[PDB]
Amino acid sequence: EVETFAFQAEIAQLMSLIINTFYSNKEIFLRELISNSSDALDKIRYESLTDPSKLDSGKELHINLIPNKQDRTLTIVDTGIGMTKADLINNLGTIAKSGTKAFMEALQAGADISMIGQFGVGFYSAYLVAEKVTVITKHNDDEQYAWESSAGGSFTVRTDTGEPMGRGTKVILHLKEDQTEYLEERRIKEIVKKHSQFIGYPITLFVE
């Protein structure tokens, strides 16, 4: 049911660096995940122009943010193109290798963590706040999968037994104890306004 994999070394290093660097401007993680969601929504929207049956797994194109204080989780849901098994195990990490490498050179040369997105690797900024990240994702061409990592050099992928999601990606951030401010309605709004106000899809905050 469950396979465990090692991160590429460079990504495993970016991850320790993100978990072990004192860096207080942690809010930018939301911006980056909303930005990944937006690119995924662009992609399915574009593909649907030539093949409208790609939207048979769901027409609405949106981002839901879903704080949950009792679980200490923040879930970002998009109805973008989703990820295949190859994407999760291989292809995205292969792509992220070069940008991770540049990003770390850039940090050594004075850049700061907030520029992570310009290297295509903003996803791993989740680890500024999350001790564990679960990604549930469904691409039209594939089954539903659950990726998960608490960093420390590995991640698992398994096919996902739970509720079907149709098409898309759900990123479930298990927050560090000291990061629970990112579960507050006001704080999330503030972040979204400040950082994500030009995203061309509806972002809905789910209030508890």
Ligand X SMILES: O/N=C(\c1cccnc1)c1ccc(O)cc1O
* Residue 10 sits in the site that holds ligand X (CB under 6 A): no
Nearer to ligand X, 108 or 166 (CB): 166
Using only C-alpha atoms, what is the Rg of the chain?
A: 16
Nearer to ligand X, 110 or 164 (CB): 164
Q: Strand order in 154-159's β-sheet?
A: 2-6, 154-159, 144-149, 130-138, 168-175, 73-78, 63-68, 203-205
Task: Tell me which DSSP letter residue 17 carries.
Answer: H
Residue 138 pairs in a beta bridge with 144, 168
- What character string, x for contact with ligand X (CB under 6 A) and - otherwise, covers 40-79? x-------------------------------------x-
List phi, psi (to 5°) of 157.
-130, 130
The stretch among 23-31, 37-45, 177-185, 187-195 that binds ligand X (CB under 6 A) is 37-45
* Residue 84 sits in the site that holds ligand X (CB under 6 A): no
Residues 143-182 that bind ligand X (CB under 6 A): 169, 171
Nearer to ligand X, 18 or 81 (CB): 81
Nearest residue to 37 (alpha-carbon basis) of 167, 168, 164, 125:
168
- What character string, x for contact with ligand X (CB under 6 A) and - otherwise, covers 120-149? ---x--------------------------
Nearer to ligand X, 22 or 167 (CB): 167
The nearest distance, CB 186 to ligand X, in angstroms, is: 23
Q: How far apart are CA 193 and CA 35, in angstroms?
A: 13
Provide the angle, in degrees to the nearest 10, between the axes of the packed helices 28-50 and 185-195.
60
Binding site for ligand X (CB under 6 A): 33, 36-37, 39-40, 78, 80-83, 92, 123, 169, 171
